[PDB]
PDB file of N, CA and C in Angstrom:
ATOM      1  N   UNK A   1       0.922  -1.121   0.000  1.00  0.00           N
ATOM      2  CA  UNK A   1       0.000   0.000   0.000  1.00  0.00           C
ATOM      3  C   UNK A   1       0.964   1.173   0.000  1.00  0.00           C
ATOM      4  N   UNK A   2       0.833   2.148  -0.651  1.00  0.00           N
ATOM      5  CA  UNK A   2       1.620   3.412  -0.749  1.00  0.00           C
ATOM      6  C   UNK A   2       0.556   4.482  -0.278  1.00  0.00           C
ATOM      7  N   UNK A   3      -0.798   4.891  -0.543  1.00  0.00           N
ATOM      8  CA  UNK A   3      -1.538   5.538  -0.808  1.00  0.00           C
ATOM      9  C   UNK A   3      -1.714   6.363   0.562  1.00  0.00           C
ATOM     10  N   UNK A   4      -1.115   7.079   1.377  1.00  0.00           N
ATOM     11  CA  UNK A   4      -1.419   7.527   2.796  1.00  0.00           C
ATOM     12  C   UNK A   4      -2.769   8.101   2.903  1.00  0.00           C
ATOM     13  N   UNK A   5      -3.133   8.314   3.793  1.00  0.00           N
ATOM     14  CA  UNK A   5      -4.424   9.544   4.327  1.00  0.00           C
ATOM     15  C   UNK A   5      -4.341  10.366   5.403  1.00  0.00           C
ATOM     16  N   UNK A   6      -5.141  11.062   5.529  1.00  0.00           N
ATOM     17  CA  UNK A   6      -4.744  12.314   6.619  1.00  0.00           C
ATOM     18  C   UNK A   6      -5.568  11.757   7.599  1.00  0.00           C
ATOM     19  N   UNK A   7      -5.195  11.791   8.905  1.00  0.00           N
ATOM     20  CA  UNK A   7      -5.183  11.097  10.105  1.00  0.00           C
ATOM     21  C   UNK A   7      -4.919  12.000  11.103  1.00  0.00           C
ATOM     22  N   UNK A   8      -5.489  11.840  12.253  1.00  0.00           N
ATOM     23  CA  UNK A   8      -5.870  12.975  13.132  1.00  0.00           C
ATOM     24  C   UNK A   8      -4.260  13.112  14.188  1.00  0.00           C
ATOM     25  N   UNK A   9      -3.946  13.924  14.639  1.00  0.00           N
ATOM     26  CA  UNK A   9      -2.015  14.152  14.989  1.00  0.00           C
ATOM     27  C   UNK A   9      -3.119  14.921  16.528  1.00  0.00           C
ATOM     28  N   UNK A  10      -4.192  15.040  16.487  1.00  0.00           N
ATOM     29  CA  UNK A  10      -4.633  15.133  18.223  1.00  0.00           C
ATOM     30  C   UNK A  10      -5.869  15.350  18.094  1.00  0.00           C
ATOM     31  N   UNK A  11      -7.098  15.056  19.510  1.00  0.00           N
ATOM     32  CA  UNK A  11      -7.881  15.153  18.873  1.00  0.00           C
ATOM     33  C   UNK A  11      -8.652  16.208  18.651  1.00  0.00           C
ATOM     34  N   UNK A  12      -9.448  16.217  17.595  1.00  0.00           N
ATOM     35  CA  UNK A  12      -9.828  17.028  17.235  1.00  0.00           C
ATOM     36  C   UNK A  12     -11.692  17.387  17.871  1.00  0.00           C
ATOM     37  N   UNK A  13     -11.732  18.336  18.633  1.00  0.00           N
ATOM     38  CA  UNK A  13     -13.517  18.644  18.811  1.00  0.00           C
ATOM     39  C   UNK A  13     -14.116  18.478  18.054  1.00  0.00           C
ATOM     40  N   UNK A  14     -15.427  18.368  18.387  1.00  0.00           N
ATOM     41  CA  UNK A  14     -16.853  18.440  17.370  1.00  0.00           C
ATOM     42  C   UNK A  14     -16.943  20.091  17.325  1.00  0.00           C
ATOM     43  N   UNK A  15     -16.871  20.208  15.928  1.00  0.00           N
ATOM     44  CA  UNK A  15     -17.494  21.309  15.170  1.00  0.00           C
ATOM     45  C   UNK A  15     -15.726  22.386  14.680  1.00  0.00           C
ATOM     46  N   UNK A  16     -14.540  21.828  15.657  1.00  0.00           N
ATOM     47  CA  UNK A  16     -13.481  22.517  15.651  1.00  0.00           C
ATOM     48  C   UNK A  16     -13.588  22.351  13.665  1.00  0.00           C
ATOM     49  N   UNK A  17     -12.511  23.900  13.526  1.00  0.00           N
ATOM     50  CA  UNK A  17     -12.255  24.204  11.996  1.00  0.00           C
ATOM     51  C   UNK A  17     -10.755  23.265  12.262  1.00  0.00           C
ATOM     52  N   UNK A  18     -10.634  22.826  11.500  1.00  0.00           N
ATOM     53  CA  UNK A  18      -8.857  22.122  11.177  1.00  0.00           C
ATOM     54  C   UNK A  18      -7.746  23.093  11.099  1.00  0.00           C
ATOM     55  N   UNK A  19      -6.724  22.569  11.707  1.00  0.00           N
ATOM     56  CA  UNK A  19      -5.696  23.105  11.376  1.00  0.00           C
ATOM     57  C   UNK A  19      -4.292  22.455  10.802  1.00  0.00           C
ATOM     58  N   UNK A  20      -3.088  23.277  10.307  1.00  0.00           N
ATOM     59  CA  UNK A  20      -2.316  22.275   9.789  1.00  0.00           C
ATOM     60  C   UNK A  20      -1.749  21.261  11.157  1.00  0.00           C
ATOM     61  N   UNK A  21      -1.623  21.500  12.407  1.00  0.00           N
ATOM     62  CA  UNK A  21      -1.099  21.190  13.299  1.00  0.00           C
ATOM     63  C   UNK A  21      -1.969  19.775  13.830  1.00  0.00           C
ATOM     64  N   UNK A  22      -3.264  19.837  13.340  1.00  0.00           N
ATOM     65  CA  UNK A  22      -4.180  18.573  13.752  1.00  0.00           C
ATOM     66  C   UNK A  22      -3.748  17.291  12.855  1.00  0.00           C
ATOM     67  N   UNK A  23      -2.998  17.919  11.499  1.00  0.00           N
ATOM     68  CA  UNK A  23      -3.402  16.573  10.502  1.00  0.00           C
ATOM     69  C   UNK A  23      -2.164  16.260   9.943  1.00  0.00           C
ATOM     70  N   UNK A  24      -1.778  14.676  10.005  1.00  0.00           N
ATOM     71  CA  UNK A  24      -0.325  14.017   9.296  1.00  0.00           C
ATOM     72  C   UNK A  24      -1.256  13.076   8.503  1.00  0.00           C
ATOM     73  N   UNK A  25       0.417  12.804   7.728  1.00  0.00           N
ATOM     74  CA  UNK A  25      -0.541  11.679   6.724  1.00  0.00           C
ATOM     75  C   UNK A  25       0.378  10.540   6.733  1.00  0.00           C
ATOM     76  N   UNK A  26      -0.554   9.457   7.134  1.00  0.00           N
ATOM     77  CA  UNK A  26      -0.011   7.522   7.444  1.00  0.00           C
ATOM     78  C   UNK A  26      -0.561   6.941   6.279  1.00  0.00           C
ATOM     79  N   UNK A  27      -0.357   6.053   6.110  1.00  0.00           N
ATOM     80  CA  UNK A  27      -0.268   5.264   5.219  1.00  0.00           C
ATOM     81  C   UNK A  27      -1.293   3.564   6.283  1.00  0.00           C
ATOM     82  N   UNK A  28      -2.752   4.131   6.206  1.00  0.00           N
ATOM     83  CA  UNK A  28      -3.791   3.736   6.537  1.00  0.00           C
ATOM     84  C   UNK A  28      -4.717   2.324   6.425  1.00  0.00           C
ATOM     85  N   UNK A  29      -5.437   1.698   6.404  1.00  0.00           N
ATOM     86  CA  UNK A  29      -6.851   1.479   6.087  1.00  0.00           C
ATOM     87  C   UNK A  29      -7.696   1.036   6.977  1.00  0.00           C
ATOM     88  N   UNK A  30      -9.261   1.455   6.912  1.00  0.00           N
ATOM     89  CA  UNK A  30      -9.136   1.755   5.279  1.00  0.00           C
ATOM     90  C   UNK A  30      -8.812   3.522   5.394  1.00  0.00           C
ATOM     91  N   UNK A  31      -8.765   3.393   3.915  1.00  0.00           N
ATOM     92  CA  UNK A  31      -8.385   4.949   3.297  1.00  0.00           C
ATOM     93  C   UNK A  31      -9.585   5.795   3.382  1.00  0.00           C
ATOM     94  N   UNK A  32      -8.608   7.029   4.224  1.00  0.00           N
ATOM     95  CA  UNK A  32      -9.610   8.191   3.931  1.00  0.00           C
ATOM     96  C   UNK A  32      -9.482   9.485   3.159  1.00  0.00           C
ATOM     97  N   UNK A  33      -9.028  10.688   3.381  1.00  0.00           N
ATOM     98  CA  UNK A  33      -9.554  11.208   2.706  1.00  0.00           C
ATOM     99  C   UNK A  33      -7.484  11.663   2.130  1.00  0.00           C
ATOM    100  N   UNK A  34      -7.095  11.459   0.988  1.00  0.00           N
ATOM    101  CA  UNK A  34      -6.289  11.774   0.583  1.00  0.00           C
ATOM    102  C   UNK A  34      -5.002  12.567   1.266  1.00  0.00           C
ATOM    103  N   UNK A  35      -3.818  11.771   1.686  1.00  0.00           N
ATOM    104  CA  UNK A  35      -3.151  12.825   2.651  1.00  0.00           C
ATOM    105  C   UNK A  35      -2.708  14.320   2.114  1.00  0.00           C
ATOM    106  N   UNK A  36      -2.377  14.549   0.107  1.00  0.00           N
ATOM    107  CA  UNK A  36      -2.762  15.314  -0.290  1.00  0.00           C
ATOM    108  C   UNK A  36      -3.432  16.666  -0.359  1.00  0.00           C
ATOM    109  N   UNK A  37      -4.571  16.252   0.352  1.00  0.00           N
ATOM    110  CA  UNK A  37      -5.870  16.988   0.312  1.00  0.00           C
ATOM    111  C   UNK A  37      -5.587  18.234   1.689  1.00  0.00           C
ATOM    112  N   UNK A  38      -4.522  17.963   2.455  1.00  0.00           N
ATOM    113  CA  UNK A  38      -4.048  18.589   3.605  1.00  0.00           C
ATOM    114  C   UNK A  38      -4.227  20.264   3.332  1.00  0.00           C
ATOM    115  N   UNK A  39      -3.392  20.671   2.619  1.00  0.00           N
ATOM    116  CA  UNK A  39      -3.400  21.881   2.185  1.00  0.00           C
ATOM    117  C   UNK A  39      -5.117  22.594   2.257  1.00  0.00           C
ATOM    118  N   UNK A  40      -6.149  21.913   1.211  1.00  0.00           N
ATOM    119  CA  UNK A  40      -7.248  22.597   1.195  1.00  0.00           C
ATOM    120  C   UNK A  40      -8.640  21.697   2.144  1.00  0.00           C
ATOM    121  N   UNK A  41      -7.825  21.240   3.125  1.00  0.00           N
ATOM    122  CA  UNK A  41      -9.041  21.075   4.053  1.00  0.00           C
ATOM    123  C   UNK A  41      -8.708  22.436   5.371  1.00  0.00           C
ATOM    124  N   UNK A  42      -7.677  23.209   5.738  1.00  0.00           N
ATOM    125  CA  UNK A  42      -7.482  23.758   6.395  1.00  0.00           C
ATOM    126  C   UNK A  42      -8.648  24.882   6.454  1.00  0.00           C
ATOM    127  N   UNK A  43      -9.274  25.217   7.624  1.00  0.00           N
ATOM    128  CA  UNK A  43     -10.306  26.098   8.190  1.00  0.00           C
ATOM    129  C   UNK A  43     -11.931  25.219   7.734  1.00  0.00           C
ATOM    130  N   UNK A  44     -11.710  24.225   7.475  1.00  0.00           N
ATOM    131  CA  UNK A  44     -12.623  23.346   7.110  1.00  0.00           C
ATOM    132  C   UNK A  44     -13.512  22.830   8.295  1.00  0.00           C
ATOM    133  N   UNK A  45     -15.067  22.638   8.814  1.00  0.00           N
ATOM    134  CA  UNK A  45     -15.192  22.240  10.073  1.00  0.00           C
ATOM    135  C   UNK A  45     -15.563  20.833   9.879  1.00  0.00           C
ATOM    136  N   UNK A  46     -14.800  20.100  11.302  1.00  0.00           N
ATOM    137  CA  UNK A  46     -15.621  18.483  11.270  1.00  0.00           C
ATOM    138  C   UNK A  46     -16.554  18.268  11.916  1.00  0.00           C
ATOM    139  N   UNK A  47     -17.557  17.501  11.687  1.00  0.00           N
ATOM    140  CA  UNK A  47     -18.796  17.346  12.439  1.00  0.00           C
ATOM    141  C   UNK A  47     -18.980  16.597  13.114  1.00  0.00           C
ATOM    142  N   UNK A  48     -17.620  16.119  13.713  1.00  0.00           N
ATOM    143  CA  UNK A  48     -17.747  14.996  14.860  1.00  0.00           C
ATOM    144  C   UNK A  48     -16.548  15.217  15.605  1.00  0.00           C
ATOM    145  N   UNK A  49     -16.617  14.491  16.928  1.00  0.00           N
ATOM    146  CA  UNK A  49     -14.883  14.374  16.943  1.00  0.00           C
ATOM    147  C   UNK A  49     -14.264  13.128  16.350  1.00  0.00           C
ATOM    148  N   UNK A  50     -13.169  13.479  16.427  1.00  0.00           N
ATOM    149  CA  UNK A  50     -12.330  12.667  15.814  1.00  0.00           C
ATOM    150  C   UNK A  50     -10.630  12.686  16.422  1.00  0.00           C
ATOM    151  N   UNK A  51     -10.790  11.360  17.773  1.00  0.00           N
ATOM    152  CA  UNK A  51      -9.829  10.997  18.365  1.00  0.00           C
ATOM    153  C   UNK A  51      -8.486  10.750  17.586  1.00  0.00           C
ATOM    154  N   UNK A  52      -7.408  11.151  18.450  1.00  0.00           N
ATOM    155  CA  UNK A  52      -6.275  10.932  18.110  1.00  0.00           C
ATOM    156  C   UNK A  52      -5.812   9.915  17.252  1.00  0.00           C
ATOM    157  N   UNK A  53      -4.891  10.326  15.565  1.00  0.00           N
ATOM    158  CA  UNK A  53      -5.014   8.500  15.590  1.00  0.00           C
ATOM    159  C   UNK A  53      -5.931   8.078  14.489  1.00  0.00           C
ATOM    160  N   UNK A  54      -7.170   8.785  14.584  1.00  0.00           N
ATOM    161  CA  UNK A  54      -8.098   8.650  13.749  1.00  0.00           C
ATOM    162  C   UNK A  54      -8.245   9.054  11.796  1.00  0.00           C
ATOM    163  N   UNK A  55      -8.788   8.181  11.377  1.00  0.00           N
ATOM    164  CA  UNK A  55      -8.527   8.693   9.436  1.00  0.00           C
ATOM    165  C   UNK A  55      -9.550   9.409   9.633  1.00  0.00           C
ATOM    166  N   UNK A  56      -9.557  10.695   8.865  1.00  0.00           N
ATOM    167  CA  UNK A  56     -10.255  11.272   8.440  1.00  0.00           C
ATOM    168  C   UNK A  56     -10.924  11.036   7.133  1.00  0.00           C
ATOM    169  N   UNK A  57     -12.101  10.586   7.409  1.00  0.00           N
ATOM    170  CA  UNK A  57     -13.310  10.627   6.191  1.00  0.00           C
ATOM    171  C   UNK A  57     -13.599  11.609   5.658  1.00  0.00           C
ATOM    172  N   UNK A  58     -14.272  11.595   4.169  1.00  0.00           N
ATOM    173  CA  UNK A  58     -15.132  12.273   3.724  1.00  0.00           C
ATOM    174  C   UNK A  58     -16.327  12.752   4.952  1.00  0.00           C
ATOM    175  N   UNK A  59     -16.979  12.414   5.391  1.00  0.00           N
ATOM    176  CA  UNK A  59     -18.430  12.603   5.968  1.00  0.00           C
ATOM    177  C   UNK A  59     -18.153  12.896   7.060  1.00  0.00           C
ATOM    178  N   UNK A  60     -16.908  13.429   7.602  1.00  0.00           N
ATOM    179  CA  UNK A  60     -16.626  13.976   8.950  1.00  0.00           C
ATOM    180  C   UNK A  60     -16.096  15.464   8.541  1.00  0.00           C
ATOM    181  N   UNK A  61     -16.174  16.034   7.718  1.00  0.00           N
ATOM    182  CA  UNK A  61     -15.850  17.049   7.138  1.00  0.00           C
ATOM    183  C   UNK A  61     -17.001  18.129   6.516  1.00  0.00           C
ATOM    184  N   UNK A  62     -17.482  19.171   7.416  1.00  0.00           N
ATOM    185  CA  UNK A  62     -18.413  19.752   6.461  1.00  0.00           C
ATOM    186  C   UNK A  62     -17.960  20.697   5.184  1.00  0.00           C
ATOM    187  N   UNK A  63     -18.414  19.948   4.211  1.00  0.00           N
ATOM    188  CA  UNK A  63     -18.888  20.923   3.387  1.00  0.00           C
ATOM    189  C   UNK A  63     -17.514  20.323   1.995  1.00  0.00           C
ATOM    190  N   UNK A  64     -17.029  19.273   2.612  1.00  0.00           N
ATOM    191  CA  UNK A  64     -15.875  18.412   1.859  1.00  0.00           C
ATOM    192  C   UNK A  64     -16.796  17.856   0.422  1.00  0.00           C
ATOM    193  N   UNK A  65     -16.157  17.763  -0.698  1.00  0.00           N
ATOM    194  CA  UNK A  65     -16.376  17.263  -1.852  1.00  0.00           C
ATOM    195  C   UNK A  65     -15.507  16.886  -2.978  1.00  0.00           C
ATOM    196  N   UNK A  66     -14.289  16.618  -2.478  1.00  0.00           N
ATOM    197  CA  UNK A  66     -13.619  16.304  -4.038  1.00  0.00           C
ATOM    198  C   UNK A  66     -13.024  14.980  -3.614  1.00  0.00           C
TER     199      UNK A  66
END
């Protein structure tokens, strides 16, 4: 597997906006949301928490679409 994802580096509150300091990217599964994608999820809010450790999904992300 090469394909990493962005994965939670602490945790993160319900409703907190992201920052670069919340999110690294491991090499996962399953896969979530592109470790890539780092750059333009920043000020983005999640709609859950999401413990330390944790992949970040699509559907924990409001307003995420690509």
């Amino acid at each position: 597997a090469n394909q990493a994802s962005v994965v939670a580096n602490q945790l993160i509150p319900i409703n907190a906006a992201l920052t670069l300091v919340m999110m690294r990217s491991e090499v996962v599964t399953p896969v979530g949301i592109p470790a890539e994608d780092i750059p333009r999820l920043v000020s983005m809010q999640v709609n859950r928490a999401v413990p330390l450790g944790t992949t970040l999904m699509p559907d924990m992300v409001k307003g995420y679409a690509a």
